[PDB]
Amino acid sequence: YEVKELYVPENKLHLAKTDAETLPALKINKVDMQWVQVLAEGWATPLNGFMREREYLQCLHFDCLLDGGVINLSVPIVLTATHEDKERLDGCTAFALMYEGRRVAILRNPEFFEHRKEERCARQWGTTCKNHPYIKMVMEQGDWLIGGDLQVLDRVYWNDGLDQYRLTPTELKQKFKDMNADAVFAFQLRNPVHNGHALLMQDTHKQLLERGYRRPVLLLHPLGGWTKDDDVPLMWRMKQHAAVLEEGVLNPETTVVAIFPSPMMYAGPTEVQWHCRARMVAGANFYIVGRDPAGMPHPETGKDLYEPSHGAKVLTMAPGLITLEIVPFRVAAYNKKKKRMDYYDSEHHEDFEFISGTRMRKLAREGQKPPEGFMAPKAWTVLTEYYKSLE
Amino acid sequence: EVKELYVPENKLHLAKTDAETLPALKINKVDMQWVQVLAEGWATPLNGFMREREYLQCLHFDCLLDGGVINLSVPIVLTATHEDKERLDGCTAFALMYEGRRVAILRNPEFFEHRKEERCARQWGTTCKNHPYIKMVMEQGDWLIGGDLQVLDRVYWNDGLDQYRLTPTELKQKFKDMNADAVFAFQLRNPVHNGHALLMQDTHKQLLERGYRRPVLLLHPLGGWTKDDDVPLMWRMKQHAAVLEEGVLNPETTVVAIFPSPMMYAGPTEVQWHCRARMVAGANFYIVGRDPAGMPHPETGKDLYEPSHGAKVLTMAPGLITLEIVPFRVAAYNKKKKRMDYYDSEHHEDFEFISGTRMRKLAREGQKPPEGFMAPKAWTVLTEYYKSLE
Ligand SMILES: Nc1ncnc2c1ncn2[C@@H]1O[C@H](COP(=O)(O)OS(=O)(=O)O)[C@@H](O)C1O
Ligand SMILES: Nc1ncnc2c1ncn2[C@@H]1O[C@H](COP(=O)(O)OS(=O)(=O)O)[C@@H](O)[C@H]1O
Ligand SMILES: [K+]
Numbered sequence: 065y066e067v068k069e070l071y072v073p074e075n076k077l078h079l080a081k082t083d084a085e086t087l088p089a090l091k092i093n094k095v096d097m098q099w100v101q102v103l104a105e106g107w108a109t110p111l112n113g114f115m116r117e118r119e120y121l122q123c124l125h126f127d128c129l130l131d132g133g134v135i136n137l138s139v140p141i142v143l144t145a146t147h148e149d150k151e152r153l154d155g156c157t158a159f160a161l162m163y164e165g166r167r168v169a170i171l172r173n174p175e176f177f178e179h180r181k182e183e184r185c186a187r188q189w190g191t192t193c194k195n196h197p198y199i200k201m202v203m204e205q206g207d208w209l210i211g212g213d214l215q216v217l218d219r220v221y222w223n224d225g226l227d228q229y230r231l232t233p234t235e236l237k238q239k240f241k242d243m244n245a246d247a248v249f250a251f252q253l254r255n256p257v258h259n260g261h262a263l264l265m266q267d268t269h270k271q272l273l274e275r276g277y278r279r280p281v282l283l284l285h286p287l288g289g290w291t292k293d294d295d296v297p298l299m300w301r302m303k304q305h306a307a308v309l310e311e312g313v314l315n316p317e318t319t320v321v322a323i324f325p326s327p328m329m330y331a332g333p334t335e336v337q338w339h340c341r342a343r344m345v346a347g348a349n350f351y352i353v354g355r356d357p358a359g360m361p362h363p364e365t366g367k368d369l370y371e372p373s374h375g376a377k378v379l380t381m382a383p384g385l386i387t388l389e390i391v392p393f394r395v396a397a398y399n400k401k402k403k404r405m406d407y408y409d410s411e412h413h414e415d416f417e418f419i420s421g422t423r424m425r426k427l428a429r430e431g432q433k434p435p436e437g438f439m440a441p442k443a444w445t446v447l448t449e450y451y452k453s454l455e
Numbered sequence: 456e457v458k459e460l461y462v463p464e465n466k467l468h469l470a471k472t473d474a475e476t477l478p479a480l481k482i483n484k485v486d487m488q489w490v491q492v493l494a495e496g497w498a499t500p501l502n503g504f505m506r507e508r509e510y511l512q513c514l515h516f517d518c519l520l521d522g523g524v525i526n527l528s529v530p531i532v533l534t535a536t537h538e539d540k541e542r543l544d545g546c547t548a549f550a551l552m553y554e555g556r557r558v559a560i561l562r563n564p565e566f567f568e569h570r571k572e573e574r575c576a577r578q579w580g581t582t583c584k585n586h587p588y589i590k591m592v593m594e595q596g597d598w599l600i601g602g603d604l605q606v607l608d609r610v611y612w613n614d615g616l617d618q619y620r621l622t623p624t625e626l627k628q629k630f631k632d633m634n635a636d637a638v639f640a641f642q643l644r645n646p647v648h649n650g651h652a653l654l655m656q657d658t659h660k661q662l663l664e665r666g667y668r669r670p671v672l673l674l675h676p677l678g679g680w681t682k683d684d685d686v687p688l689m690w691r692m693k694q695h696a697a698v699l700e701e702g703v704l705n706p707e708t709t710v711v712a713i714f715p716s717p718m719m720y721a722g723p724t725e726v727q728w729h730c731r732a733r734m735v736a737g738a739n740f741y742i743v744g745r746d747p748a749g750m751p752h753p754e755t756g757k758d759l760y761e762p763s764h765g766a767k768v769l770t771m772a773p774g775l776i777t778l779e780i781v782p783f784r785v786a787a788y789n790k791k792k793k794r795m796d797y798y799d800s801e802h803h804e805d806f807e808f809i810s811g812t813r814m815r816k817l818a819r820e821g822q823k824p825p826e827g828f829m830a831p832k833a834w835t836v837l838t839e840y841y842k843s844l845e
């Protein structure tokens with residue numbers, strides 16, 4: 065499938081920047097800007113811009129875009145707006161999007177429709193807790209939505225020393241061709257890589273070898289847009305990942321590291337389909353999913369928001385993901401008896417230690433290194449440096 | 456191809472005897488209405504109450520996906536308590552009991568978490584309190600039981616309306632016998648006024664212009680659980696019969712039947728269920744207007760659902776491949792024309808919305824609605840209904 069970038073072609077860029085100057089403008093924040101990037105680069109192919117009411121309904125009710133062939137798209141990609149914004153811009157055939165004083169895109173032939181936040185949130189997240197970090201933001205947004213045809217002007221760069229890893233779906237496909245990959249397997253992550261993740265990646269690599277693939281390539285694809293405030297920063301995670309690769313826990317010769325530009329929504333089984341379909345767009349043939357993907361603890365009752373087995377189950381059954389195979393895994397934990405990461409077994413409960421991100425910080429605070437084989441020692445060292453800086 | 460879950464009539468004695476030998480689970484009236492839905496084949500190709508994978512599929516995608524795509528947008532599930540689960544977990548089969556009577560065998564059971572709050576948020580698109588169906592869900596247990604269902608004796612309600620309770624198979628057989636060349640279906644839960652009739656008449660005429668010679672109307676009122684302030688089924692049936700009596704709808708080209716499903720008031724999610732059920736009964740066209748399956752927010756009074764969403768979602772919904780959706784704009788009483796007409800804003804002051812409360816008010820006042828809003832005899836049935844309220 066062809067990736068539909070929404071960037072104005074190089075030759076036509078100046079003429080478009082000229083037109084953008086004369087139009088009215090809407091100011092957008094960093095998160096909207098990240099959604100603009102997701103759209104420009106083609107991650108939400110075949111959308112031509114921010115969702116009109118028709119696509120919005122399709123993704124909310126069916127988790128698929130239906131016009132052009134069934135293709136999975138389970139999250140709204142929408143632009144919000146106040147009644148003030150609406151009354152100002154309603155009745156014009158185009159306006160410019162503005163971020164940090166710069167006119168970043170043109171939205172053409174806009175349509176205004178009701179946000180209906182309660183329904184959107186209930187269907188997207190399975191809850192309307194306004195203490196959910198992303199939902200909190202949605203609830204602070206306007207009651208109107210704007211759809212339309214999006215024309216993105218200047219290519220998006222963040223100028224933070226990580227732009228070299230922000231490869232488009234097209235750049236990623238070119239990369240895999242250059243490497244002579246005969247199978248690409250993808251691992252989405254928002255956390256530091258431990259050897260449970262590596263176990264999933266290594267076992268997927270072995271499964272691909274056993275099927276007859278000779279040059280399977282890992283796409284290690286950390287998420288790089290908005291995350292909740294207690295998540296490990298992207299720069300610190302990038303450093304931690306490099307340490308894992310340097311230690312050879314993952315092989316740097318058969319691995320591609322890129323940053324996935326999407327905001328994190330913590331919407332569990334609905335979001336896992338979004339993470340999946342975006343890797344499909346980038347040329348992934350296999351997608352790894354473990355326990356409780358895209359999940360978080362309910363804010364209040366510290367219980368899992370989503371049932372931990374559901375992400376894999378739902379993704380396994382999901383339509384509009386035909387060209388990519390799901391590789392599901394059960395929980396991996398540290399096996400004390402074998403002194404390595406292993407798949408959890410209830411018949412041997414007390415063999416296993418579970419170490420969460422909260423447990424990791426506390427361990428560091430207490431001058432501890434995690435057990436041998438839980439994490440590459442060098443990568444742990446990077447983590448201890450992150451925890452120390454939190455002071 | 457309907458998959459009835461009733462046991463064949465010559466296998467029935469064996470099945471009732473087998474059912475006697477089993478542990479039992481008592482079910483309520485609404486549960487019983489869902490057993491009837493399943494038994495009659497309205498949820499084809501379901502084998503019984505949903506297992507976890509089907510439940511996940513319909514919550515997340517509005518479709519069954521195993522070896523084909525068929526629309527199914529509502530959980531058809533059997534709830535259980537922790538005590539019920541404790542007792543029945545490990546049974547290869549058990550009976551369902553309603554009013555001391557064994558009505559069904561559930562075989563090869565599987566228990567999975569209900570996750571009520573998540574279920575409700577995805578199904579109703581709301582976490583609002585005081586929804587009438589959601590309120591019954593919240594009172595139920597945290598476990599669900601799926602499995603293969605064999606229903607026993609034909610379900611009768613013995614209320615004087617069982618002759619309207621046709622299975623999809625009987626409806627198809629009926630259409631054949633009337634030489635129908637097209638069946639258009641109309642779902643309803645309210646009294647029929649002449650705006651409803653306008654939708655039906657214009658579908659009839661559009662079907663004639665399209666080439667069909669014997670189009671049949673399936674007037675198909677919903678007959679299972681409904682909220683407290685809705686008009687009782689027996690009264691709605693008398694009111695519809697008056698409408699046909701007056702020939703606002705032609706009794707010769709119309710089949711009246713009662714759809715057994717509980718009413719969930721879930722808007723766009725529920726309209727798909729209403730639509731797919733008529734597809735099973737051989738409907739080729741399905742009429743939908745504004746706010747189908749909708750209701751006001753108990754608190755704010757604002758529409759729970761955006762009124763145009765039902766028709767929009769339905770027209771683009773998957774798994775309804777042999778049925779044509781016939782979407783309509785708002786019909787309302789036109790004063791300048793003295794008749795029911797399609798709502799238009801340039802002439803907005805010519806229109807009046809005549810609701811259930813406008814009608815109850817005119818009833819306690821000896822006033823009729825304007826001429827052309829309803830058939831005179833049908834209005835009379837309603838005045839008798841309102842009389843009986845106090
Ligand atoms: N005034 C109207 N204009 C257009 N369609 C209408 C109007 N009133 C009701 N309808 C509709 O008639 C059908 C049955 O409506 P109701 O019996 O009120 O409630 S429903 O729950 O079954 O949808 C629906 O398709 C529908 O939206
Ligand atoms: N201990 C584990 N066992 C099995 N799978 C795991 C484990 N920890 C994380 N996963 C998973 O690893 C992948 C990335 O997890 P995270 O980065 O923590 O969160 S996620 O938001 O990207 O899903 C997911 O597929 C996933 O469910
Ligand atoms: K607003």
Ligand SMILES: [K+]
Binds near residue numbers: 535536538595596598
């Ligand atoms: K319980």
